[PDB]
Design a protein around this ligand. Structure first.
Ligand SMILES: [Cu+2]
Ligand SMILES: [Cu+2]
Ligand SMILES: [Cu+2]
Ligand SMILES: [Cu+2]
Ligand SMILES: [Cu+2]
Ligand SMILES: [Cu+2]
Lengths: 422, 422
């Protein structure tokens, strides 16, 4: 139940008053066939193109838009494609159907197949992080990062040129103890066009290590630094344009554990939110390219968890069991937008405000603001089963790829939430 | 039977698919009421605005356009408004009438009243010329011309600033005998903004008298010249821009009679064709203004006989009697367009080719090319009655005001032309 979306603009084409497809598999097609699989949720966005009165109606679903009157006037509607077959969408305004305003919704049996990928999977699995460090003394820790430029699967028929730490977004989850001495090796791949670097928000001194790690392609820099302060820190590339290096995917988290370790918890997850600024709108197939004017004006097309559309729903969702306490390390690479981080169907037992690991966490919190170059820790107990949904509660960002699933097996109805009265 | 014309563009307005009026009393009105008087001929021009399929139909007249499909695709139709009342014009394409494509034709009893004029009547009556000079000796002839700038009635709710000889278009018909000595006085009115002058095509020497008659406002020039050559000559202002002075109305005819006089004829007429180059299209009400880019590019809006729309139909038509031989002195002031001069329902008995009064006229001629700065003489016998129609047979110029009537009382049916077989 991540909705199949179709956008229709009313207008004049092929000598008729028609619906015209916008984006996706239907861009610029007149009265496009909307192909949907049994049991999918369907969202249809109607936008008035030419300025007559219009709706869209599907009789066998008793589903309709509102009547949209002026140019750009819009109405979205949804329904569950529960019945297989072909169903007319049409305009009910006097004569508009006769004039040509009519197409077919095709509901096909069986589950939608995955689109065979074209580019490397650049999505970091949210379970791909080191677990708690044992109790142990401070020591010297060697960390190896490689900066890799590579084409990645941004969406299921859409590619983009990512810049990464170790070929994934976000970069490796780095885990040390306060007092540790970090021996960082940064290798910039031979095939890189750009100089790359790293700034750790958990390091003290020039550029957060950036001033020592400006690494030419095929070259290596080595920096040592002491993890003086416990916290959950975003690290990122700091080679100009830094915003460019960040949007392209060069961000990750460094946990500097406090002496005690963090509270014991059953399961840990690694999630980072960022934006991608493409020439073409969200939903456009093929090789997307970076739009500099959109980047510097903060007008992105993609809002992503862990690098890709479907990252945390289709390719690498979160899995957990009822009764488990879960911790999410959540950071915003950005480069520009503050996340209103929230898990639909859960409440945060603990929220580590501004990523403070030393100050007491806040308790019983629905939603937390995390700035770009900021991170936090949330934990909660999975009291019961369900699909729990990670969102930025600036919820228009759903319509730009920003949604994740935490899948937890258990009955539909228990004492905590169920269908009838009690 | 000079048709009442209405232009409709299809489009989207007031949230409906509609007809939109173009020019006239209906400009930019949606589904405009077309007001017509009993027995008028109605021309409706349909132009496709937005690119759906359209026609216009009027059921009670069995009148319709063709179906027009692409943007700018057009169909004109006509009919006689023989039945008083209200009649729907509508689009017959599936659903288009329901969608809003419908207005009313209103046919009102009685004759259309004349619009009360706003500006001076600047139309030269075609009967306003001196008759044949007696047989007599060459002599000195004094001619007085006054250059007057004044607002004139271009069309029945439309004005324009005319420049004229003696407040009318064309200027006075000048009639001398070969050998005559012309003492020309040019008085430029005190209220003129511009210097004015005159070039006679029938004078020999600098500028055809123009070099002696460049007259400041409130001033007077006097030139003497010998009429050395017989001919029918256009005269015009020759103050720069000459094309500007000409379009504004500063042209007329000089007949230098050959020694014999011209062949005896019952009735004589004075007709001149010119163009006016307005910012706004033909049919636009109010004060029209000159469009310099249209003038130098030869893209006029008005094609006129004797200065005005309706000059030779409504305000000053030609009148004659069956059996009479008629002569028309016809010249093109221009400044730019060659007239294909023709009288519908008549044949030219004699045509004085290139305005040669000395070379034998051509005989039994339907239509004669007259260049700008050119004139001719045509004569014919009115064998029978009717409304005879003066045209430039470049007949799109009908739709820019270029039409005149020669009214001749007599039966509908005689031996020369009648309804049944013989
Ligand atoms: Cu509609
Ligand atoms: Cu970089
Ligand atoms: Cu930073
Ligand atoms: Cu139509
Ligand atoms: Cu002049
Ligand atoms: Cu001339």
């Amino acid at each position: 139940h991540a909705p199949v979306v179709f956008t229709l603009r009313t207008g004049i084409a092929e000598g008729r008053m028609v619906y015209i497809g916008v984006g996706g598999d239907i861009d610029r097609q007149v009265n496009p066939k909307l192909v949907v699989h049994e049991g999918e949720t369907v969202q249809i966005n109607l936008i008035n193109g030419e300025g007559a009165q219009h709706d869209a109606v599907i009789d066998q679903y008793a589903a309709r838009s509102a009547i949209v009157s002026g140019k750009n006037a819009s109405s979205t509607f949804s329904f569950i494609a529960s019945k297989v077959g072909q169903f007319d969408y049409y305009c009910s305004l006097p004569g508009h159907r006769q004039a040509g305003m009519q197409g077919v919704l095709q509901v096909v049996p069986g589950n939608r197949a995955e689109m065979p990928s074209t580019a490397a999977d650049i999505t970091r699995d949210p379970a791909d992080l080191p677990g708690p460090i044992g109790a142990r003394q401070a020591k010297t820790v060697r960390i190896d990062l490689e900066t890799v430029e590579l084409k990645g699967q941004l969406d299921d028929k859409t590619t983009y040129t990512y810049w990464t730490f170790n070929g994934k977004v976000p970069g490796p989850f780095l885990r040390v103890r306060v007092g540790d001495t970090v021996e960082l090796h940064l290798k910039n791949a031979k095939d890189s066009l750009m100089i790359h670097s790293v700034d750790f928000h958990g390091a003290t001194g020039p550029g957060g290590a950036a001033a020592y790690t400006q690494t030419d392609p095929g070259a290596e820099t080595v920096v040592t630094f002491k993890a003086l302060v416990p916290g959950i820190f975003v690290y990122h590339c700091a080679t100009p344009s830094v915003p460019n290096h960040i949007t392209n995917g060069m961000y990750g988290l460094l946990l500097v554990e406090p002496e005690g370790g963090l509270p014991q918890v059953d399961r840990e997850f690694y999630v980072m939110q960022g934006e991608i600024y493409t020439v073409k709108p969200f939903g456009t197939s093929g090789e997307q390219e970076m739009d500099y004017e959109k980047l510097i004006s903060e007008k992105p097309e993609y809002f992503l968890f862990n690098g890709s559309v479907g990252a945390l729903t289709r390719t690498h969702p979160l899995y957990a069991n009822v009764g488990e306490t879960v911790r999410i390390f959540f950071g915003v690479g950005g480069p520009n937008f503050t996340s209103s981080f929230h898990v639909i169907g859960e409440i945060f037992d603990h929220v580590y405000a501004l990523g403070s690991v030393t100050s007491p966490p806040l308790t019983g919190v629905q939603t937390v603001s995390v700035p770009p170059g900021g991170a936090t820790i949330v934990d909660f107990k999975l009291d019961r089963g369900g699909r729990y949904v990670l969102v930025d509660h600036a919820l228009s960002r759903l319509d730009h790829g920003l949604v994740g699933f935490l899948n937890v097996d258990g009955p539909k109805n228990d004492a905590i939430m169920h269908e009838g009265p009690p």
